[model samples]
Target: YLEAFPKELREYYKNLFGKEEANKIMKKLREPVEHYYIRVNTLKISREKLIGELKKEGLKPLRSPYLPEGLYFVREGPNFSDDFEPKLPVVVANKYAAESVYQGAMLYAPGVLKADKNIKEGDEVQIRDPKGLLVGIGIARMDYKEMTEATRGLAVEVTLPKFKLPSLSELKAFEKGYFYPQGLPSMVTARVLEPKEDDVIIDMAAAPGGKTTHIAQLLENKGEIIAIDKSKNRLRKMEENIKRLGVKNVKLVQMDARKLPDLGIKADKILLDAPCTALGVRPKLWEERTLKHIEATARYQRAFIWAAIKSLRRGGVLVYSTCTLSYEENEGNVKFMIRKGMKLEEQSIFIGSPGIGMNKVQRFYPHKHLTQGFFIAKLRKVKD
Candidate 1:
């Protein structure tokens, strides 16, 4: 309805919902917020041990059913303002709790206040407040103090977080020849590809290499996995993750995904985790949305999907996935792909809602399911 109104009339909404809620619902008109959470790889550490550490600090942890290593904590503890000299003033409990915790505190030069005692330098860690709310997930650059005290160093340089998901990090994946970040989308994608010992796979737009690492794991250190990204810097970070994950089956390449044929390479299967507007993410602070931005993102994503389909070889499977809710980017793109000469294939395993128009696509919505709103479609290149 807002889309049809003239600018002067739409401005009237500012008074109706009040400024804050009005802005929120307007943003939802473009993108909706999806709550963020992370799953810690418990193979290396025990959830009980992590929870016990926080409990000892006077914070209670609740089990998150979605993620095994995840703990949801209710705020009830000594205020950090009482003990530590706060660099900033605390206005709210969540803000106050974040400022006091090691994960929330800024890494100013020198003196680490909070370090996960259980994690090592290269280990993947899920950061949270005493209340168990997820802060962000990243690999520790230096030990606790190493991060706090060093004026001239990268302290726990973040990988993926709400406020910052950098493109440069994705570009580095190409230069380093590998990338992977530990997350659900990447985890599920890797599981679906199911790379076998001695089979080859391709991850188009493989920046910060989360799915790439999973493919390597599925291959069991036996096959070749070619990871491609458009950015050089992102490939560098991907290299770091590849080395950290200790996988030998991956090779990183810096090339526009649209130009994959230029590399003269083919793989048994390909994962096309195309870029989208990221409208499904929740708990956003600012970044208001307009109709122009929404339409622009949809058009760009269509081009991306076209390129992905062209790059696949005959009989190879292509998985199209995005972290957004717009039908334009999800169902619209899938339909466009099928019309352009791709064949919809039956997924070996299915777990989400089918596409609106056809049975080729699947969607994950936060309101319906407590996860990030996402869309996944499986397609196969028919043998000519």
Candidate 2:
């Protein structure tokens, strides 16, 4: 019913699906992911223990052998037949805040740009984006009078996000940092990199260090990990996550991944979570999505991988993955690497579809994988 998206966007997706399937694809992308995939902070607790703990507190968190450390749960609506909205006034979160909340973080006071005039702490309020897109319902952690003056504390606790995301406040393991939101495909990337207790690994674009920390865990905190990215802000966020998770093997470096060879250290494995258009990202969609952006990112992604390759030891494994749907980025980049003497390696257990025209590679879809869309291609350096 809504044709607000671009023609090219619809056309690009139509190529991937049936006529009505394109609409379904768009709807799936537009519809927020009701469930969040939380990676069990293995450094702090095992998946089994965390499950037992959550169940002790009345949460039915599910685990799987396929996703060794994942805890899955669905946040649902009210059981009381009364779904009436509270008389409370509206509290708004900016796009950034809404996205963060969707990813399971609290809405910080500063992100609450506007709120009901008389709202108080514990007040139930509706959360809307700047343009009035309803984000969900939330509870003001602080009174509106206090929220405006507040700079850095929880302001509102998101309740539903239009779907259920259990309030993180009541989560026991949350207090101890036992889980963090990470895409399931990302876990696959770290697994494919196959870091060891003795291997030196380079995470070329490791900011907001999910894979970096995962690698550290895979190595049992015994190996050296040089995690480098150019953004200090993101690296700082990554550092906070690292410290929170007690991961100690990573050496965080705020340097250009394109200059990775300058580190003068050969890595047995490298994880280049290259930047891309991210068409496969869920609970997230882009209208300003342009062909120029995709093409530019593919070029930049290839260059970064080359630098990562240069920083690898002979027969080093390099796993390049992206949260995007473009053939030009996934297969194109993998094909480019292959021409450059990168050999496709045997992948471990795959839970998603095989890559288009490249079965050795794996591709994930939001509608198919029960998670966001992603493409993964693992290659080993064959030139050295």
Candidate 3:
């Protein structure tokens, strides 16, 4: 127990579990932290092209082990060039640190000198300098800002950016049916369900459509996917993503999943990527988050889960997943689902270790698996 946690936390651990159990749990939690990784948008630029460009600036890039197009820096260098430094620099802001500066640069109202080419209206993109050093990551508001006198909406919403990179507009991936971000969790969910070409699928909370698009691709665009979410703005994003990915079989709808009966829609499979506390993200440098916010998120997630279950078809497959690592959100909620008659299926993907109890759910920890901390549980409804 003393190995991973401080001695002062021992009393708190003892109060939760006992002295002996806390010792055993703490011993297993120790491991080395992994290096930060940034996945490039292959739809926008080739890996060789980016690597060649970075090399010219004396930056070395190494391929990441986890993600296909991901890269990590071999050496750290200067934040900006000596000749091109800004006089009145603007700070980038985002949920992640390394990609913050790029976000800030996109915020330039008049003109953005260098643009992160791979970004779109809602895509998560990496920010880096001409030397290939990561600045931060954020969602793009506009493609590339041009020199204009008009003052209006944001050109880019900086989620995170620390350094500025020249905007390479030629590499931006916005064309339809060309490319998509291969997100790990979304892909994993599709693999677990193994949806057939003609199977009916429903994403109960499908806004921004990451998993929904993956499922549609897995079905080879042959089946009907009812992608429903409560927010109209998020559904618009889903529409754009689906169009970009060449997914013609999805039906985007703005409606609460809990009220599916009212909409007269049913499906063979349902995916509920429930919203929860995003605690699994690492290198968190900001302090805007609080304990109260975490608790409120947990409560909101529980309600969402119950609604998800009520909408599932008989003999249909249901998958519940989250990016957070809270026990109250994962184990506690999964147990609740089991008691309510959802049959938990054994997840043999086994990419990460088994969860805390005898439950068949799988938990992926960023510190251990080198991916974001995630909880995934697959369940099936029995035929009446």
Candidate 4:
């Protein structure tokens, strides 16, 4: 419990995945990870020479069998002239900031919740979570004392990430609007939804929207998409991502996904990247989630799914996905909806493996897929 995870949580997963399988899952999640992934925005650039370009930057990645545009690179990062390794100062970012830092992103001021008192600009500091777990190492862009009273802006420039990736402050000029950072399973879910060029789509719980744009790309931006999220702040972030990708035809809405009403708008497809416990996620800076929180999150995620279904037209597809390894959140919920007469369709790409006891749905384990722990279910509505 002290090292791997809480006993209650571990026991729950053990019952779901057996003893040996559950052990492998937790053992990997606790270890420091650095696998970097990037999905090609084929809409922005063709895939004719994508591999060669990444090679120029020393990111040698493998092609995914499930995702045509997904790249899996085990990065040690390029050899930068100024490597901030060995002994250096350490900065403890809030849990959220630490989450983004590991995935090839820069550390921001608002995210810098805590740090050494005398830290100043130009000093290298390793990032940590509240508990002092080492997350990537980076160089400071501003004095720590100055940022304590501040609100937002660049705080730390990631020099070397726990995962091998360049900590560039912003997206590369070529990468922006072209290659959006998305998970392979996420892209696969969009494809499984199979939105048509003219179909009406709804992305409930869509924040920092990636799949919303992906569905649009599959449609070539000619279809209508209603991207909805409850958080005004997360919606704003999605707005920025939408603009950067040059994605059009999406009507962004700040609304609670759990409270969606019948708007007389029948969507041909709906995607719910439902909020989850995220127990399956790896290289986590912090994860002290409790059984109570997991239960609450499962309810909300189900609510989002139910609300999303109301907007789905008969025979429409709804791909419900979660980034957690919990049975209650994954197959448990899928079974919940299925028993209510929802159609449980098999996945399209069939990557990773079938769910532990769910042969129809698919799952991704870090040990199995070399990616984050993910669970995806392909569902459909056959009735009015």
Superposition error at 358 for model 3 (Å): 4.2
Winning candidate number (TM-score): 2
lDDT of 1 by residue, 1-384 (tens): 244233632464365335664454444432222323333323223567655554565545466554444544332222222123322211111333233222233322232335545445665554444334344445666655455445655444434332322121223322333222233443555565656765557888788887776666556567788888888898997887677657687888888777776666655678878777665544332224444655687788776666666666777777878876666777777778778777887665455567656685666655444455567777777742
TM-score of each: 0.60, 0.84, 0.63, 0.82
Candidate 3 achieves a global lDDT of 0.58
> Sorted on TM-score, highest at the top, how do the candidates line up?
2, 4, 3, 1
| Model 2 lDDT tens row, 1-384 | 124357776777778565776676566665455456678888888988888888888777767668788777774532212244545588878878866664445788888888779889888887766756565677888988878888899888876555455555457677687877787888888887778887878888888998889888878778789888899999999989888888888898888789888877988888888888877776653355757777888998988978877878878888988988888888988988888778998788588888878868988876776677788888888885
Q: What lDDT score belongs to each candidate, Candidate 1 first?
A: 0.55, 0.77, 0.58, 0.74
> Poorest 10 consecutive residues of model 4 by lDDT?
77-86
Clashing residue pair totals per candidate (backbone < 3 A) = 28, 1, 21, 0
List CA RMSD, all candidates. 11.2, 3.8, 10.0, 4.4
Best by lDDT: 2
lDDT of 3 by residue, 9-32 (tens): 445445544687555434323211
Candidate 3 stretches greater than 4 Å from native: 1-99, 102-177
